[PDB]
From a paper:
PHL7 has a leucine at position 210, whereas other known type I polyester hydrolases harbor a phenylalanine. To explore the reason for the considerably higher activity of PHL7, we exchanged leucine 210 in PHL7 with phenylalanine. As a result, the activity of the variant dropped to the level of PHL3. Residues G62, T64, S69, H130, S131, M132, W156, D177, A180, H209, N213 (catalytic triad in italic) are conserved between PHL7 and LCC, whereas F63 (LCC: Y95), L93 (F125), Q95 (Y127), I179 (V212) differed. Figure 2A also shows that the active site pocket of PHL7 is more open than that of LCC. However, the plasticity of these predominantly hydrophobic regions near the active site may contribute to binding of larger PET substrates and be a key for a more tolerant recognition and effective processing of PET at elevated temperatures concomitant with increased polymer chain mobility. The crystal structure of PHL7 shows a metal ion coordinated by the side chains of Glu148 and Asp233, the carbonyl group of Phe230 and three water molecules in a distorted octahedral geometry. We modeled this ion as sodium due to the electron density at this position and the high concentration (100 mm) of Na+ in the crystallization buffer.
Herein, we report a novel polyester hydrolase (PHL7), isolated from plant composts with a high efficiency to degrade amorphous PET films and post‐consumer PET thermoform packaging. All of them contained the GXSXG box, a conserved Ser‐Asp‐His triad and an alpha/beta‐hydrolase fold. The polyester hydrolase PHL7, isolated from a compost metagenome, completely hydrolyzes amorphous PET films, releasing 91 mg of terephthalic acid per hour and mg of enzyme. Structural analysis of the enzyme indicated that leucine at position 210 contributed to the high PET hydrolytic activity compared to other polyester hydrolases.
Author numbering: 2 to 259
Write the structure that this text describes.
């Protein structure tokens, strides 16, 4: 049996839910308390009886605050994850810096009295929007032990991600004019190793701002990816492989089966 499985067996509805089966609470990390990042909010399951959970850090994009990605925190955490949404050291930080800050936020969790005993520090993942998504790719490229990476409308000047060894879901927005999929998201997917567990999902009709207010398609597939790779939870592969029969997705590619 897989000791990292959490929660009941999933369905389409369970991964679309605004709140999953775990009640959650939150705690604030001040900028002063944060070493190597700008502070953040940690969302965590309150139930201690089901084991420890994997950890996820999420970065906003250029000039943006944690508020622009906050909704992802409790929506993901309620599926059985400890999730920290960060502010960056400065609003002007570029993607490589954001990646180091994502790693610093993950490493902070094991020192946080509220959540340290709720996490498995060996099972960590990174996500982010725009330059924060470029940051997620950089963090994976700088730490081959990370279990998953999810750039959401990622932006980066680096297009070649051939050294990434972390299963990566690239989420593009079809109409994005800020991080256009042709030169960002799709280029990243294409240069990730051909034998990596990876997928590309383009959100039909979506703008760059799709990640900044609740989007069920973004949430459901991010949840399934984190379950499949942070928890190695094979119950979630059915949602990722093959292409979903889902009108909200305008393009899909993957290296399924994983
Ligand atoms: Na894994």
């Amino acid at each position: 049996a897989n000791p990292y499985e959490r929660g009941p067996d999933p369905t389409e509805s369970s991964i679309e839910a605004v709140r999953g089966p775990f009640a959650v609470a939150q705690t604030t990390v001040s900028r002063l308390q944060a070493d190597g990042f700008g502070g953040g909010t940690i969302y965590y399951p309150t139930d201690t009886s089901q084991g420890t959970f994997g950890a996820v850090a999420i970065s906003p994009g250029f000039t943006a605050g944690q508020e622009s990605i906050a909704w992802l925190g409790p929506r993901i955490a309620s599926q059985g994850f400890v999730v920290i949404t960060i502010d960056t050291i400065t609003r002007l930080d570029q993607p490589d810096s954001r990646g180091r800050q994502l790693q610093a936020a993950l490493d902070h969790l094991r020192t946080n009295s509220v959540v340290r005993n709720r996490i498995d520090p060996n099972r960590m993942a990174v996500m982010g929007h725009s330059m924060g998504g470029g940051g997620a790719l950089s963090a994976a490229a700088n730490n081959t032990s990370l279990e998953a990476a999810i750039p959401l409308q990622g932006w980066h000047t680096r297009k070649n991600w051939s050294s990434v060894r972390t299963p990566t879901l690239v989420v593009g927005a079809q109409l994005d004019t800020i991080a256009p999929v042709s030169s960002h998201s799709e280029a990243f997917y294409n240069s990730l190793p051909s034998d990596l567990d990876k997928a590309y999902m383009e959100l039909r009709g979506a703008s760059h701002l799709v990640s900044n207010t609740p989007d069920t398609t973004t949430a459901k597939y991010s949840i399934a990816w984190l379950k499949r790779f942070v928890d190695d939870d094979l119950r979630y592969e059915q949602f990722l492989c093959p292409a979903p029969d889902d009108f909200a997705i305008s393009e899909y590619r993957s290296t399924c089966p994983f």
